[PDB]
Amino acid sequence: FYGHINMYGYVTSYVYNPGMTSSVNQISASTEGRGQEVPTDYYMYTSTKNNNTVELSMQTTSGVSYLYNNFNFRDYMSKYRPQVDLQSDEARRIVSDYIKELSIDYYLSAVIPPDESIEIKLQVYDFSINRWLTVSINNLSFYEKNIGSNIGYIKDYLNSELNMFTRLEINAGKRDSVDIKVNYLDLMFYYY
Amino acid sequence: AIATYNSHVELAKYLVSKADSVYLTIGKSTPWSNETNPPQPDENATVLQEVIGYKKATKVTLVRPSKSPEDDNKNLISYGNKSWVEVTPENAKAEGAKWVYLESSIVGDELPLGTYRQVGFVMDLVAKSGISKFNLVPSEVESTGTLLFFDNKQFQNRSEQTTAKERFIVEVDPNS
Amino acid sequence: AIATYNSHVELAKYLVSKADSVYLTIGKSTPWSNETNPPQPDENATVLQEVIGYKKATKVTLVRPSKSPEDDNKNLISYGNKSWVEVTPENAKAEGAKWVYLESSIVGDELPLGTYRQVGFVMDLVAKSGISKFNLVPSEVESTGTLLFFDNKQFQNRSEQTTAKERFIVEVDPNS
């Protein structure tokens, strides 16, 4: 029963806060189109660690940019576990009780001089407190690093639609843009 | 229309009748992407990744679940904390034996030393001219036959002080 | 100023008399500098590095190398790909049985799952008050007793199905 949830991705300098009934694509609508969906290559190539890194241009006017990811546990559970009753008001509890502890693995590098680094935060949206929770803080350089973390039980990170929202907060500092190379992104769970 | 439990007994007997052609095989000598969490197998494949070699199946038999007192005079198979009893082909319908137990053992460098991860079974294998030994590296095989069954375990490593006693209990219909 | 041939056998009888208190122990759970080339085991060391835990000895006995025709027709052991005979304490000097055999099996998760690189045997282990189970993690042990024998190994691994079995034959004076 061990498994991974791999790659909606959206790049923007605007802050999005999902609601309890927020769907996958509401990020683009909430930003008035002041951002872009990640390229097809991001969905194709970030599902395993190899030499094929996906480069993403993080434009910013404020010195901060965001890469949002949305993971739909309803469609995942319907595909891999159609026997689970996802129509109940308890579906978030059922899915979280089923997954138990979730870990995020996220391998990335920055297209910057090898002697420089930028601050990056991995965040998950907590619907119990209606805020972005920082689960990892790292300095990202030219060298690839996993910035992933174990986030534990996902019940409070799931909305009514069983969507989980994650983001990278990327502090470009005084730069108008920073390019990020993404090698691997995986939401991995292990239960008995 | 329907088939029967007795058909699964007869197809188990067929697989057991092939035993002279049956070898355990092991493979995947290089790492997984992470050794703790292997990738899923492929039931349409007919050979292992990174094939280390073949060893003749030391024991091919029918089984059923064990019970006492009526299996006390018999011999029992233990695996995965489960405990099972052996059945001979001419008794298979009377005992109801539709489960096959497959076992082989390797010790030392009689197949190449290193780590192993993929485990499985082949039948209708043919060895090359001038060779008759029960341990084969792939260079010694004329035809690999059909790879029937395989799995993607977490690894282990080998020497003369270790026994590669891998086994399956398999069934041709798990959900009648 | 010599020892007699009996003298080594008496120390071996002593080691076999301790058997109830004897436990397998396992350790060095993180990498060496090279997993294929371990460093030398230091005879001054009191206990394994990175201790995983302890399991009671399943078989302890005096043993000797086999001789034909007589031992071929007795109770028998195969190890080192070669043949050995078991000896009882009340015959030890007549047989010359100066080798002690030690053996235990660690099954599934009865100790925590992980890789290992050291194997050895302890006597005089005492568990904390009220514990009686044959498998112990370090926090369940009141006195670790004494590590008599161990060796460094190339890296090895375990999973929930598997049994890791380790066994030694040893002698008290390799250097007369």
Side-chain angles (χ1 to χ4, degrees), chain A residues 3 9 18-19 29 33 35 39 63 82 91 110 113-114 148 152 172-173, chain B, chain C:
Chain B
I2 62 149
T4 66
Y5 187 97
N6 298 290
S7 79
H8 311 127
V9 175
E10 283 295 323
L11 295 176
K13 276 173 54 181
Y14 166 80
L15 292 164
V16 173
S17 81
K18 303 273 288 191
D20 203 10
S21 76
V22 182
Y23 287 63
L24 181 81
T25 183
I26 57 166
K28 191 82 197 67
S29 56
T30 73
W32 302 126
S33 180
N34 186 331
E35 301 280 55
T36 301
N37 191 16
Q40 292 275 327
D42 180 0
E43 64 164 338
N44 301 162
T46 58
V47 69
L48 298 188
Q49 293 196 339
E50 306 173 318
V51 190
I52 295 158
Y54 309 90
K55 183 73 192 284
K56 194 187 181 86
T58 60
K59 187 170 182 170
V60 176
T61 185
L62 309 174
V63 296
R64 66 151 174 75
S66 65
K67 68 181 307 208
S68 181
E70 60 264 62
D71 306 324
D72 292 357
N73 291 307
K74 305 179 191 167
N75 294 170
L76 285 81
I77 283 156
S78 179
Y79 165 78
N81 313 321
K82 315 191 76 167
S83 189
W84 288 74
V85 68
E86 304 169 12
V87 174
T88 61
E90 71 290 343
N91 295 304
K93 287 159 62 180
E95 290 293 334
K98 66 86 167 191
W99 304 269
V100 185
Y101 179 69
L102 306 174
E103 176 188 312
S104 198
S105 297
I106 307 144
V107 181
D109 72 349
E110 77 180 21
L111 294 178
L113 290 182
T115 55
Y116 76 93
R117 291 165 197 74
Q118 275 198 314
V119 179
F121 294 92
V122 299
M123 80 168 181
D124 296 335
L125 182 148
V126 181
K128 289 184 182 176
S129 307
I131 310 299
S132 65
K133 60 172 181 183
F134 293 4
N135 57 300
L136 298 168
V137 292
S139 65
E140 298 171 319
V141 174
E142 179 64 25
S143 174
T144 61
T146 295
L147 180 86
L148 290 169
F149 315 115
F150 72 98
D151 186 14
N152 293 3
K153 302 195 181 193
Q154 297 87 352
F155 91 102
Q156 227 193 31
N157 194 5
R158 280 171 48 243
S159 70
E160 298 90 333
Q161 317 306 339
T162 68
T163 308
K165 195 176 69 175
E166 299 297 343
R167 49 253 178 71
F168 294 163
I169 299 163
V170 306
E171 56 200 306
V172 304
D173 179 350
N175 59 250
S176 61
Chain C
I2 70 160
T4 81
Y5 178 75
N6 309 278
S7 64
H8 307 103
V9 175
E10 298 284 25
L11 302 184
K13 273 170 54 192
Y14 171 77
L15 287 165
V16 170
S17 80
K18 300 290 287 190
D20 195 0
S21 75
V22 180
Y23 281 62
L24 167 64
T25 187
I26 46 152
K28 190 77 197 70
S29 63
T30 73
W32 299 123
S33 183
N34 183 323
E35 299 288 55
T36 301
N37 192 13
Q40 293 298 110
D42 187 347
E43 73 206 326
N44 294 189
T46 61
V47 69
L48 307 191
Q49 300 191 22
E50 305 172 314
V51 189
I52 295 159
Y54 304 85
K55 177 68 184 287
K56 197 179 180 73
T58 63
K59 185 166 185 168
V60 174
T61 181
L62 307 172
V63 300
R64 65 169 180 66
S66 62
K67 52 176 298 218
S68 193
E70 55 170 311
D71 300 332
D72 306 327
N73 293 275
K74 296 176 197 167
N75 304 340
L76 207 73
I77 287 173
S78 179
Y79 176 56
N81 309 332
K82 288 178 64 176
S83 181
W84 307 82
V85 62
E86 297 179 41
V87 177
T88 57
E90 77 295 338
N91 288 176
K93 282 163 57 188
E95 296 305 315
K98 66 160 174 155
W99 304 265
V100 182
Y101 175 106
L102 304 178
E103 172 173 36
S104 194
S105 300
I106 296 163
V107 183
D109 68 324
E110 81 176 319
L111 296 177
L113 299 175
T115 63
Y116 67 94
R117 290 156 204 77
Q118 282 185 331
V119 178
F121 290 85
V122 301
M123 67 166 187
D124 290 320
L125 186 143
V126 183
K128 289 178 179 182
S129 305
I131 309 299
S132 71
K133 61 181 179 84
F134 292 3
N135 57 306
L136 304 168
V137 296
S139 58
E140 299 177 311
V141 178
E142 177 61 16
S143 180
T144 67
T146 295
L147 181 72
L148 295 171
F149 310 101
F150 82 109
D151 205 353
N152 287 352
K153 296 198 174 200
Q154 294 169 227
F155 85 133
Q156 283 293 359
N157 192 39
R158 277 164 51 244
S159 74
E160 298 169 315
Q161 306 163 28
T162 62
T163 301
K165 199 178 77 163
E166 307 285 341
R167 54 179 178 155
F168 293 172
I169 297 176
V170 300
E171 60 188 295
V172 302
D173 179 2
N175 60 184
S176 61

